Amino acid sequence: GITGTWYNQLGATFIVTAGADGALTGTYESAVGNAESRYVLTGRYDSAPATDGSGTALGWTVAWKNNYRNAHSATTWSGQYVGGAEARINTQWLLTSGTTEANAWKSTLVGHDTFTK
Amino acid sequence: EAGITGTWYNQLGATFIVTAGADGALTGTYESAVGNAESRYVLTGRYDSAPATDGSGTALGWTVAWKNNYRNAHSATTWSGQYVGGAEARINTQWLLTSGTTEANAWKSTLVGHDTFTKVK
Amino acid sequence: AEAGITGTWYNQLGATFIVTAGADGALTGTYESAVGNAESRYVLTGRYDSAPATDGSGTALGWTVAWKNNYRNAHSATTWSGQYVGGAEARINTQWLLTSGTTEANAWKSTLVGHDTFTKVKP
Amino acid sequence: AEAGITGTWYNQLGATFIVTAGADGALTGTYESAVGNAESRYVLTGRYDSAPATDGSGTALGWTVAWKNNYRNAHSATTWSGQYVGGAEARINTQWLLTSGTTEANAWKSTLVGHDTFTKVKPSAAS
Ligand SMILES: O=C(O)CCCC[C@@H]1SC[C@@H]2NC(=O)N[C@@H]21
Numbered sequence: 264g265i266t267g268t269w270y271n272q273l274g275a276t277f278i279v280t281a282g283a284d285g286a287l288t289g290t291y292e293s294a295v296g297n298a299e300s301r302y303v304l305t306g307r308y309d310s311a312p313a314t315d316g317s318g319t320a321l322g323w324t325v326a327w328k329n330n331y332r333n334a335h336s337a338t339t340w341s342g343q344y345v346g347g348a349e350a351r352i353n354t355q356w357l358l359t360s361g362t363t364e365a366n367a368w369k370s371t372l373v374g375h376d377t378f379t380k
Numbered sequence: 381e382a383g384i385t386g387t388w389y390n391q392l393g394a395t396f397i398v399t400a401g402a403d404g405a406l407t408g409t410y411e412s413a414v415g416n417a418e419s420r421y422v423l424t425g426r427y428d429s430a431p432a433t434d435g436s437g438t439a440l441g442w443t444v445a446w447k448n449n450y451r452n453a454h455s456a457t458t459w460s461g462q463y464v465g466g467a468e469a470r471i472n473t474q475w476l477l478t479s480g481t482t483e484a485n486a487w488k489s490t491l492v493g494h495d496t497f498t499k500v501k
Numbered sequence: 502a503e504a505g506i507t508g509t510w511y512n513q514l515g516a517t518f519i520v521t522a523g524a525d526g527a528l529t530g531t532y533e534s535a536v537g538n539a540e541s542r543y544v545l546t547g548r549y550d551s552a553p554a555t556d557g558s559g560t561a562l563g564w565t566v567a568w569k570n571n572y573r574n575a576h577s578a579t580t581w582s583g584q585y586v587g588g589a590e591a592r593i594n595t596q597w598l599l600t601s602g603t604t605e606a607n608a609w610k611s612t613l614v615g616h617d618t619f620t621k622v623k624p
Numbered sequence: 625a626e627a628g629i630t631g632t633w634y635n636q637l638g639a640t641f642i643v644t645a646g647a648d649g650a651l652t653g654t655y656e657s658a659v660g661n662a663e664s665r666y667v668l669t670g671r672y673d674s675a676p677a678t679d680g681s682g683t684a685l686g687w688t689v690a691w692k693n694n695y696r697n698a699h700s701a702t703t704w705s706g707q708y709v710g711g712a713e714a715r716i717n718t719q720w721l722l723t724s725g726t727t728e729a730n731a732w733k734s735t736l737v738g739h740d741t742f743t744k745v746k747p748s749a750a751s
């Protein structure tokens with residue numbers, strides 16, 4: 264149910280394949296911030312979830328370097344896939360930029376993204 | 381390689397074994413001493429393979445889904461942070477732990493915290 | 502629509518937030534949750550920017566509830582941090598942290614995080 | 625209210641946190657930051673659990689600063705959420721959210737997250 268092409272409330276394009284082992288692999292493209300064109304992603308998901316109506320746990324990471332640009336930063340998304348006639352992936356995320364140790368207290372942004380097919 | 385590649389330990393007694401590839405990949409295993417977890421779990425992630433040379437740390441992140449051959453907690457953690465080199469190198473992080481829940485219980489699905497890793501001991 | 506932070510507000514979880522914004526920056530009022538280890542109303546206090554920018558920016562604010570009243574005590578506290586938007590509708594967008602008291606061995610799992618959006622028109 | 629949470633507290637970033645805990649559950653006082661767009665003292669208010677568990681658990685609490693005083697305005701607010709742990713090495717252990725006001729287009733980057741630990745013993749340094 265997870266494999267396919269997804270979009271969020273910020274105009275992003277999330278392309279991902281879920282392997283039978285628990286792997287997540289694919290590409291991320293952001294419409295905002297210090298970013299252009301596509302970026303590599305990798306993560307993990309629960310391949311035998313509970314059967315009681317609970318969602319399926321997952322996560323993935325992007326490091327914001329590619330052939331066109333390097334922002335010296337990385338985002339991780341943590342959340343759950345909820346199946347159904349209108350499938351969704353609901354997340355919260357942490358964006359850390361590299362800093363001097365004197366600026367380390369302001370290194371990390373927090374937010375939330377919702378994805379649909 | 382040297383630097384991030386190695387065996388790391390946090391303040392909760394975890395053992396984090398990782399390899400950093402020249403292509404920006406992180407690969408390895410994670411063992412937790414706390415929570416609904418037993419033995420080792422697979423991890424994967426990414427890092428900046430060309431950091432700034434102005435004294436800044438190196439940005440990185442990784443994910444564990446808590447299922448292996450011993451048990452399954454129906455959950456996953458992501459760690460987001462930076463690597464700082466030198467005589468007392470560290471990896472400094474914040475994390476999000478999401479558990480699978482019904483819709484009505486989604487407001488209490490996610491724990492947040494902070495872990496510091498060192499290569500000593 | 503009715504402008505101003507002072508008023509009666511509802512979130513996407515069934516909660517009610519009743520607040521007054523004072524001229525010096527203070528927030529005072531009550532909070533009622535429809536989920537968790539809670540019943541009836543609880544005291545809150547907080548702060549807001551009483552002279553915000555006017556370049557399209559929202560108004561920054563925050564408040565705290567400790568989950569003890571005359572009916573129940575959950576031994577926990579939540580803080581909400583966010584901004585009053587000030588666009589075409591009355592809306593406040595927030596992120597929150599809920600910490601429960603724990604022993605030291607359980608402190609790693611002490612804190613939940615999430616996001617609530619509040620509107621004067623019940624959603 | 626005269627001891628415990630009440631007192632002068634210091635964190636790992638050089639801040640000074642001066643607070644009084646009332647019998648009624650209230651927190652009142654001043655906060656001074658040594659980093660960021662901030663100068664001199666700011667007003668704070670918050671709440672704590674005035675009847676905590678007796679099994680050895682910490683005391684739950686939270687407070688807010690809006691970063692406006694007579695000297696400057698950063699158009700932002702921070703909330704700290706955490707617990708008080710008493711003893712010879714008493715601490716207040718916290719996680720925090722700092723929201724800046726932004727346009728609707730930039731709302732995705734409005735909020736910083738971190739963690740502060742406070743002690744009643746003033747750090748040594750430096751002159
Ligand atoms: O600015 C950077 O350092 C890199 C681009 C960051 C984009 C962020 S990741 C979280 C959020 N969701 C998106 O689709 N874009 C932003």
Ligand SMILES: O=C(O)CCCC[C@@H]1SC[C@@H]2NC(=O)N[C@@H]21
Nearest residue numbers: 392394412415416417453455457
């Ligand atoms: O209980 C679970 O659902 C799985 C085990 C969670 C262990 C967490 S991950 C964050 C923190 N750091 C650790 O080393 N262990 C805990």
Ligand SMILES: O=C(O)CCCC[C@@H]1SC[C@@H]2NC(=O)N[C@@H]21
Nearest residue numbers: 516534537538539568575577579
């Ligand atoms: O169970 C508790 O410890 C006390 C009640 C907590 C309810 C939380 S506060 C964050 C979220 N928003 C709501 O309106 N309710 C929940």
Ligand SMILES: O=C(O)CCCC[C@@H]1SC[C@@H]2NC(=O)N[C@@H]21
Nearest residue numbers: 639657660661662691698700702
């Ligand atoms: O830059 C601003 O907008 C206001 C100053 C923010 C300072 C922060 S609050 C969290 C952290 N702890 C401190 O003692 N200082 C910083």
